[PDB]
Amino acid sequence: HFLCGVVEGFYGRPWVMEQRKELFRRLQKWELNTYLYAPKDDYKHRMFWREMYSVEEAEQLMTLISAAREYEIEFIYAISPGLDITFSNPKEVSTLKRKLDQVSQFGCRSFALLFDNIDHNMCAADKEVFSSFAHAQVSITNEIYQYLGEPETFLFCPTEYCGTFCYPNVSQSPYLRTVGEKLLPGIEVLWTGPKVVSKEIPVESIEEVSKIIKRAPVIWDNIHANDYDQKRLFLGPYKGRSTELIPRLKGVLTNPNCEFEANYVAIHTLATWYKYSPQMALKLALTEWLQEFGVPHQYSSGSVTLEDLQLLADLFYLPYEHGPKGAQMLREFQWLRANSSVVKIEEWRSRAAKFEEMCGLVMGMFTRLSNCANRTILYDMYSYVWDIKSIMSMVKSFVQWLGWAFRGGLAGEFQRLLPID
Amino acid sequence: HFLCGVVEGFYGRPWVMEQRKELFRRLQKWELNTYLYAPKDDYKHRMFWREMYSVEEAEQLMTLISAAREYEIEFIYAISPGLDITFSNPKEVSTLKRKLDQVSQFGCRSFALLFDNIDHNMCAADKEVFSSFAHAQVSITNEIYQYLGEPETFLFCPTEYCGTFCYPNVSQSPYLRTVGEKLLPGIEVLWTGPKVVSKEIPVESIEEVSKIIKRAPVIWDNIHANDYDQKRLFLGPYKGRSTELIPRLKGVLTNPNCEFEANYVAIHTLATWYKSNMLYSPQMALKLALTEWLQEFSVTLEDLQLLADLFYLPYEHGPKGAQMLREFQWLRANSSVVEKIEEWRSRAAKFEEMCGLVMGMFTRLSNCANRTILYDMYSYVWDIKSIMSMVKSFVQWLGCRSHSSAQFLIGDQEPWAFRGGLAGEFQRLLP
Amino acid sequence: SRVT
Amino acid sequence: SSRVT
Ligand SMILES: *[C@@H]1O[C@H](CO)[C@@H](O)[C@H](O)[C@H]1NC(C)=O
Ligand SMILES: *[C@@H]1O[C@H](CO)[C@@H](O)[C@H](O)[C@H]1NC(C)=O
């Protein structure tokens, strides 16, 4: 059974249960199957990981795992204990087992252990017991596997979870050789690609990693991940992963934007790709998303378009790429600024006009997005669309003036001073 | 009565009821009295001002207006029909009344009409019936004041609601002239200062406006508003406002940060400045607020002191923020010096440490217990935390230059070395 | 300032 | 430390 779905795997506010239930409706509607529970900053997933769910939280989680079953979505409960765990103390281990059990008794049939973004060293007690860092994860992992009874899905996220993160390189890695050889052939290995946010996940590279770990990996994809930049949102199509990768992979679990309602394209298209042109796949997704907008019902006395959503997506597209309308406006503004010294030049004025109208459409897009019925959708994207429309007003002004002191605040001030911006 | 507390008046995601109830609590706990309901993007407050609250909506408004009365907080409900209302048409007025009626029936005694941020012109029908735009606004506000039975508190935010916005100046403007003379003296008037978000409210200016509106205004205070700037958050003391104002004002309602749990300092300190003069020290207030706040969150006072200084006020960083900036501006300026330069090294060590503190603050905030407070500030705290890494590591780099000529970026990056996305790119081309 |  | 992606 190939795994395809979403991993709620990001830093910041986690999604509420009413949202996660909505996630399950959609995943089923788009014929996806998995959900990997892993929100870095949900209390007892990581920081206070040993601590057992209160009876009121135990109620909410059991209701969630049930809803997962209701919608034929497999629920994989992951735990990230690697911050401050002593790998050899059996009180640690017995507090892990006891927690996993607590979840097991909510329904949960599938699990995961995540050792990502943690110190490569370990305390002196464990220096004694295990030879390398790998060996200590492999050991506590393999035990917890057998303890729970070898469930059908069990996932392990390595510390060297992408190509750049392997020392010295992907193939000849002490750490990855130890995982490959000694991790029980039943459990699965997560992998984000060349880089943490891989622009491309090429086939060669998945073979280069599949050898060293003795198995086909499950992609934790951060293509649509947002947590790393307060001004970035990603609404462009799933892209840079060949459909040829499917024969060489056990899954793809996309770690998407923090804002729930902002992930309709990222997941719609992943499911399209699961059955590929990303330009086509977007249109399919934008066209279908548009119906979720609507305009409030009225018993008394301008509605968002497909051309609006195409512009929204193009301005908040992908990590390594702006959408076409975004790229174009940015080209046209670069040409207008650099040719401002020509004020025969009817060209500048005819292209000024066209860009001022391009700017106008961004303002129109926010006006209409503001008047829509789905306020959940509006609130989740508000501060993003606000920003784009206000920079565009400032840019519309500035172009006309050829014919923000504290902006960003302290962060912004320091950032302008770095010479790489 | 002198009105003092919070206007939920910002653009974007409004607060949910259980947030608004926890606010009423705090307004009482710190001896504040009023709450103006005017969140720009609760659709029935403005864009669909004509629309009656539904059944399930009604229960919420009613249960809210309850918790306000229970906590002796004075609920003012606002409505902003400014955009698309035809002022001259009787059926349009009837809707406005009918809706105000509907809310009256939830409990609401106090009301408000806002006419901020709208086109200064009006339609065909209004040009006939009304001599000026100002005449139109005062007419329906009067008619509505009298229809509701003339309640104790009833506000009017004008279109020209700050100094910068009066054509041509404050005293010489037809608009504010018309409002002073023709607008019923039982109606109060909202004012934000010389500007929309004011650095200082000088007493001289509040007199200059007191005369032309013919009364003591109520201040909508945008000082801690953060709805205009995605990267900005304001945890600074209530400041730039003279206690000497109190006597000359009918109130001060602070329009604060969208993130609810980050308004503790913003309101707590407004409380100490109301209480002090029913003089006052912004630096003291802050220390009181930050010590008290800390009970709610392992996170230290120093951590919060730093935090508040990093995210201080619209026109001013805090001491530890401003000094970190000075040093980094000095360190990069005098970096061409890689005897006589033991100074740069020993200061680059002082700096790399103060960066280490911002990292530690974040570790400790993320291990904290109060997750409501963590989540409301997470993206703000992660941003500074992470800009500081790139800064600390760039000072490091300038140092290890004596014995290297590697680039500052090692080859091909992760995305978060090139920030801001499209918006960010456009912005770095404005001069 | 910046804006409203 | 820092311990992040
Ligand atoms: C003006 O701008 C402030 C902050 O941008 C916003 O909160 C406020 O709602 C707008 N209107 C008025 C009257 O202040
Ligand atoms: C690494 O970075 C991504 C995006 O910053 C973050 O969501 C994720 O939690 C971290 N772990 C993995 C496997 O990506």
Author numbering:
A (entry chain A): 59 to 333, 374 to 399, 551 to 592, 603 to 662, 679 to 696
B (entry chain C): 59 to 336, 373 to 391, 552 to 592, 602 to 694
C (entry chain D): -3 to 0
D (entry chain B): -4 to 0
Paper text:
OGA is the unique enzyme responsible for O-GlcNAc hydrolysis from a large number of cytoplasmic and nuclear proteins. Recently, our group and others have independently identified crystallizable constructs of OGA that comprise the catalytic domain and stalk domain, and published the apo form structures and enzyme complexes with active site inhibitors. These reports consistently showed that OGA formed an unusual arm-in-arm homodimer, where the catalytic domain of one monomer covered by the stalk domain of the sister monomer to create a potential substrate-binding cleft. Exploiting our previously reported construct of OGAcryst (residues 60–704 with the unstructured insert residues 401–552 replaced by a glycine–serine (GS) linker), we solved the structures of a mutant OGAcryst-D175N (catalytically impaired but retaining the ability to bind substrate) in apo form and in complex with each of four synthetic glycopeptides.
In the substrate complexes, all the glycopeptides were bound in the OGA substrate-binding cleft. Particularly, the GlcNAc moieties were anchored by the same set of OGA residues in the catalytic pocket, displaying nearly identical binding conformations regardless of the glycosylated residues or the flanking peptide sequences. Consistent with the O-GlcNAc hydrolysis mechanism, the catalytic residue D174 was optimally positioned to make a hydrogen bond with the N-acetyl group of GlcNAc in all the complexed structures. The N175 mutant side chain played an important role in anchoring the glycosylated hydroxyl of serine or threonine and stabilizing the OGA substrate complexes. Compared to the glycosylated serine, the extra methyl group of the glycosylated threonine (as found in ELK1 and Lamin B1 peptides in Fig. 2c, d) was well accommodated in the hydrophobic pocket harboring F223 and V254 residues from the top surface of the catalytic domain and W679 from the stalk domain of the sister monomer. Finally, in the OGA-Lamin B1 complex, the peptide was primarily stabilized by side chain specific interactions with the cleft surface residues: valine (-1 subsite) was engaged in hydrophobic and van der Waals interactions with W645, whereas arginine (-2 subsite) participated in forming a hydrogen bond with T626. We find that OGA is able to bind peptide substrates in different directions, but in a conserved conformation regardless of the glycosylation site or flanking sequences.
